[PDB]
Amino acid sequence: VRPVWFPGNPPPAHLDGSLAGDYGFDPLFLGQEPQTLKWYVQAELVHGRFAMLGAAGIILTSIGAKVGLGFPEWYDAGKVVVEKNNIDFPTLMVIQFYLMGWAETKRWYDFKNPGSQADGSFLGFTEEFKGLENGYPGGRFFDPMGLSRGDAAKYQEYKQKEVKNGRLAMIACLGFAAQYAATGKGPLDNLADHLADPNHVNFATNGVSIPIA
Amino acid sequence: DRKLWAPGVVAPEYLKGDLAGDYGWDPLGLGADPTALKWYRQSELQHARWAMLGVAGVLVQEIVKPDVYFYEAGLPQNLPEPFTNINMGGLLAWEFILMHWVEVRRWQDYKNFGSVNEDPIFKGNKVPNPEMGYPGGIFDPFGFSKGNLKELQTKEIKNGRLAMIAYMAFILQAQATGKGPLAALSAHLSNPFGNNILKNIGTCTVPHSVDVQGLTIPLTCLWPGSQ
Amino acid sequence: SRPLWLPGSTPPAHLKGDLPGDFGFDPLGLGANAESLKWFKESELVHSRWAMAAVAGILVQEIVRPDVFWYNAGKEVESPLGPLGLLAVEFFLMHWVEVRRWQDLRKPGSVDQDPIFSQYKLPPHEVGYPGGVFAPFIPGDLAELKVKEIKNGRLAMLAFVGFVMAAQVTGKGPIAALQEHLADPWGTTIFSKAAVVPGQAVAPPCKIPASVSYKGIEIPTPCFLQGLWP
Numbered sequence: 237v238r239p240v241w242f243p244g245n246p247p248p249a250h251l252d253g254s255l256a257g258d259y260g261f262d263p264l265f266l267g268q269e270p271q272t273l274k275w276y277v278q279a280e281l282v283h284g285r286f287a288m289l290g291a292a293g294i295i296l297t298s299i300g301a302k303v304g305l306g307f308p309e310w311y312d313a314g315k316v317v318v319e320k321n322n323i324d325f326p327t328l329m330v331i332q333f334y335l336m337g338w339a340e341t342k343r344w345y346d347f348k349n350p351g352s353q354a355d356g357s358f359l360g361f362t363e364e365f366k367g368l369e370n371g372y373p374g375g376r377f378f379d380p381m382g383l384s385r386g387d388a389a390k391y392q393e394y395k396q397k398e399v400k401n402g403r404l405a406m407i408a409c410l411g412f413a414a415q416y417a418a419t420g421k422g423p424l425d426n427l428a429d430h431l432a433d434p435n436h437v438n439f440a441t442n443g444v445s446i447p448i449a
Numbered sequence: 450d451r452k453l454w455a456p457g458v459v460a461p462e463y464l465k466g467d468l469a470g471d472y473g474w475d476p477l478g479l480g481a482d483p484t485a486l487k488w489y490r491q492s493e494l495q496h497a498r499w500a501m502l503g504v505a506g507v508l509v510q511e512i513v514k515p516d517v518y519f520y521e522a523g524l525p526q527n528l529p530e531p532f533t534n535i536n537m538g539g540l541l542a543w544e545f546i547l548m549h550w551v552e553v554r555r556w557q558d559y560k561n562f563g564s565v566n567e568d569p570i571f572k573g574n575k576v577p578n579p580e581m582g583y584p585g586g587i588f589d590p591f592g593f594s595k596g597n598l599k600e601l602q603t604k605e606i607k608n609g610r611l612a613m614i615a616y617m618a619f620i621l622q623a624q625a626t627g628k629g630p631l632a633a634l635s636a637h638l639s640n641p642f643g644n645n646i647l648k649n650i651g652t653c654t655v656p657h658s659v660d661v662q663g664l665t666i667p668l669t670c671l672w673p674g675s676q
Numbered sequence: 677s678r679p680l681w682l683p684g685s686t687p688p689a690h691l692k693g694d695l696p697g698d699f700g701f702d703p704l705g706l707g708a709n710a711e712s713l714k715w716f717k718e719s720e721l722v723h724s725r726w727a728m729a730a731v732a733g734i735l736v737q738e739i740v741r742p743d744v745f746w747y748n749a750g751k752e753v754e755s756p757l758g759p760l761g762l763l764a765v766e767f768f769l770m771h772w773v774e775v776r777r778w779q780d781l782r783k784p785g786s787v788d789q790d791p792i793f794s795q796y797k798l799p800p801h802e803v804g805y806p807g808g809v810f811a812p813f814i815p816g817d818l819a820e821l822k823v824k825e826i827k828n829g830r831l832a833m834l835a836f837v838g839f840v841m842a843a844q845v846t847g848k849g850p851i852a853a854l855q856e857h858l859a860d861p862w863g864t865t866i867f868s869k870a871a872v873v874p875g876q877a878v879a880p881p882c883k884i885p886a887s888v889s890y891k892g893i894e895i896p897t898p899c900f901l902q903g904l905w906p
């Protein structure tokens with residue numbers, strides 16, 4: 237009864253519509269096993285939330301570069317930051333995996349053993365690391381405003397928004413990479429060029445996407 | 450028993466003649482949802498009433514000031530003497546503020562019918578608002594609504610639908626020929642066979658953009674006419 | 677039953693008119709959680725009371741000292757106490773005042789006693805409204821006065837934001853900026869100096885220097901979210 241990605245086709249048995257963003261899309265049956273699906277649900281949310289941060293960061297800095305505030309392009313930012321600020325790349329890389337390793341490992345072992353991180357072993361904190369649902373930590377640290385601790389109906393609506401905006405951001409980040417490879421320019425240079433002449437400046441005329449053209 | 454848009458057709462089960470100007474016409478079935486029909490009826494009234502003002506404005510303005518091309522009347526240099534070369538940004542500020550108020554007031558009436566009938570400052574002033582889209586009261590000072598309202602609503606929607614088609618005829622005629630509705634009529638009468646759509650449809654007389662006090666505004670015809 | 681921010685609308689369930697200034701406005705549902713609302717209620721009063729004093733302070737400075745721009749008052753002010761002497765006093769005095777206010781919020785009634793003089797104590801009170809020595813004079817009904825405080829407070833919070841963005845866009849104080857509007861109202865609004873259309877975006881230039889030199893150091897002074905300006 238619920239809308240599906242391919243109208244007319246029944247949804248698969250293992251997608252029962254409870255999860256956020258459930259449109260019955262799993263043509264390769266990758267999440268058929270329930271234990272695999274829980275792992276994939278968290279994988280989609282981690283990917284989506286990183287993509288949303290990346291899309292917003294790329295967009296903001298691209299605007300700054302466009303209006304001449306001196307920001308580099310996202311594909312040049314890495315070089316400019318280390319050279320301008322005299323930062324050792326390997327040292328920054330090691331710190332990143334220490335901090336991400338700690339946060340990721342604790343997340344990893346909450347999936348393997350829910351609520352196991354709330355025993356007080358980490359500096360005595362108990363409730364903030366209990367977790368609420370698979371992929372939805374909650375609590376005072378991860379949900380300081382308690383928007384998951386108010387109206388239940390409102391909370392479910394936010395889950396639908398989060399995953400949909402997350403999927404859109406993942407597609408957008410794929411677009412940034414593909415557009416940079418095809419055009420060699422920044423995302424808003426591409427947008428500006430399209431707006432100037434939409435009929436003649438698009439992927440069909442970039443000389444790469446349609447090689448036979 | 451009412452006449453329908455075509456002979457031998459059957460009106461949709463949800464079009465029973467309750468609304469004015471009901472010919473049972475809905476090829477795309479957009480009005481099958483009862484909630485959508487109410488919203489689409491409001492937008493039809495807005496298009497009908499704004500279109501009638503548009504046709505009257507273009508026709509009256511062309512008679513009063515034949516030298517002014519209605520298509521370009523929006524440029525600040527073409528404004529009347531008191532407002533000539535007025536800051537278009539400041540002009541837009543008034544329109545945004547005032548239209549946002551009246552449109553949200555009208556919008557809240559759709560959301561909760563009968564909830565914004567009263568003056569928010571001077572309590573006691575109210576509009577009857579018998580039906581959604583028909584405020585009445587201060588909006589009907591001459592009291593014509595105190596009569597055959599259903600007949601008047603039929604007349605309003607019939608003239609409104611005709612004006613909607615009429616105005617888009619003005620826009621397309623302006624783009625194709627670069628003349629106002631009355632100027633276009635005169636051109637046809639003088640040379641009916643040498644001046645008609647068969648020859649003008651291939652030409653779009655609108656520039657690709659115009660400069661308005663330093664801001665470049667993109668322009669477009671409604672079809673890929675030959676610039 | 678009560679006037680609403682949007683007349684004809686239905687307020688959210690978690691808002692019932694108990695709080696002063698409750699006009700049923702919480703579109704995002706930030707105050708649904710009871711514990712969050714207690715913290716947010718305290719925060720709104722503090723923001724409003726700071727903003728009211730700041731807006732009144734800025735206006736009086738301009739009248740009394742029209743030659744000094746309030747946005748520049750940080751660097752133009754010279755006193756014997758110096759920069760770090762003033763900051764040190766401010767830090768300790770504010771740390772004491774804020775921790776005591778904070779403790780009342782966590783555990784109401786626990787900081788009503790005067791630490792030094794044992795005979796002075798605040799009478800029992802609601803959180804955010806410490807009576808006693810803080811309220812020697814109450815002109816009228818508290819319920820009505822609480823509404824007046826929050827309504828003037830919410831207006832002063834917006835006024836300060838108006839001062840900041842006007843200063844960065846015009847480089848003038850609130851009164852000087854107003855007189856500019858009155859001279860040419862049709863050519864001084866934000867619409868009159870900015871516009872974005874498909875293919876072209878025009879924004880005003882930031883009228884604040886990118887940096888300030890102050891006693892041998894350079895203080896960055898960036899405009900607020902300039903890249904996002906209309």
Ligand code: CHL
Nearest residue numbers: 746747748749750751762763766767888890895896897898
């Ligand atoms: C409510 C607080 C407050 C606000 C809103 C401002 C606002 C302003 N000050 Mg002012 N100041 C404030 C407090 C103070 N200022 C100064 C001293 C100065 C100087 C010397 C200068 C300004 C300047 C400015 C302007 C631009 C600053 C900027 O962009 O910096 C960008 C941001 C930074 C440089 C750092 C930001 C720090 C961070 C936001 C907060 C840090 C909090 C502390 C760690 C907390 C601990 C300390 C204690 C005391 C609370 C702007 C109008 C400059 C000006 O006039 O430009 C034209 C200028 O030169 N201020 C003192 C010392 C008495 C303050 C004490 O509270």
Ligand code: CLA
Nearest residue numbers: 255256257258259260261262266267276277279280403406
């Ligand atoms: C890595 C990101 C990722 C992951 C792990 C998932 C995971 C999931 N998605 Mg999601 N999805 C994603 C990205 C992702 N999605 C994106 C970007 C979109 C937008 C196009 C969607 C749109 C979408 C819909 C509409 C639905 C799901 C659903 C699901 C669930 C069931 C299907 C499944 O088991 O897939 C497991 C997936 C993987 C193990 C990833 C395999 C990746 C391979 C190796 C590469 C694929 C490359 C790809 C074809 C390139 C596309 C290019 C093109 C865009 C030009 C599951 C939790 C269904 C659901 O019920 O959700 C609640 C559902 O209805 N997803």
Ligand code: CLA
Nearest residue numbers: 625645646647648649650651652653671672673674675676
């Ligand atoms: C199937 C219908 C069809 C299609 C796909 C095209 C396609 C094209 N026409 Mg042609 N054209 C047609 C029918 C059609 N035409 C007819 C019937 C006439 C006579 C009225 C013309 C007269 C005409 C001219 C004068 C020019 C073109 C040109 C063009 C180009 C588009 C730009 C333009 O100015 O269009 C303008 C044309 C139209 C908007 C015609 C729309 C016809 C619709 C789609 C079909 C239904 C029409 C209907 C029966 C009413 C006809 C009029 C009525 C009074 C009898 C393009 C190659 C231009 C070009 O590039 O020339 C080199 C150009 O200058 N066409």
Ligand code: CLA
Nearest residue numbers: 725726729730732733734736737740741744749750752753
């Ligand atoms: C948010 C509060 C605030 C802040 C941070 C400032 C900051 C400043 N003011 Mg402003 N001012 C404020 C409120 C504020 N004012 C208010 C409410 C008024 C109206 C009475 C004024 C009237 C005013 C004038 C007339 C002048 C300033 C000036 C100044 C500057 C120099 C201050 C100085 O020399 O102090 C020196 C301090 C003293 C000699 C002792 C002051 C002791 C006071 C009276 C105690 C107040 C206690 C009270 C309970 C605090 C409540 C704080 C808060 C909760 C509201 C400085 C930038 C001067 C300026 O512009 O210089 C360039 C200036 O001429 N202010």
Ligand SMILES: CC(/C=C/C=C(C)/C=C/[C@@]12O[C@]1(C)C[C@@H](O)CC2(C)C)=C\C=C\C=C(C)\C=C\C=C(C)\C=C\[C@@]12O[C@]1(C)C[C@@H](O)CC2(C)C
Nearest residue numbers: 262263264265266283286287290293294310313406409410
């Ligand atoms: C597209 C994508 C995944 C798409 C997956 C698809 C379609 C899967 C489809 C299916 O599997 C299903 C569902 C079900 C199966 O039955 C069928 C198939 C068909 C197999 C992921 C993107 C995932 C994208 C992600 C995570 C992007 C992250 C980006 C980040 C962190 C960027 C960071 C920075 O950009 C900043 C901010 C500033 C710069 O200067 C520096 C850097 C570092 C570059």
Ligand SMILES: CC(/C=C/C=C(C)/C=C/[C@@]12O[C@]1(C)C[C@@H](O)CC2(C)C)=C\C=C\C=C(C)\C=C\C=C(C)\C=C\[C@@]12O[C@]1(C)C[C@@H](O)CC2(C)C
Nearest residue numbers: 475476477478496499500503506507519522613614616617
């Ligand atoms: C509002 C409107 C016009 C408004 C014009 C105005 C204000 C003009 C103002 C000015 O000109 C002046 C006075 C003077 C100028 O100097 C300046 C401007 C500013 C230019 C027209 C709408 C015009 C609207 C039109 C033509 C709409 C037509 C819709 C149709 C035919 C729909 C049909 C169907 O939807 C049904 C009903 C049922 C479905 O099942 C099937 C289908 C077929 C989809």
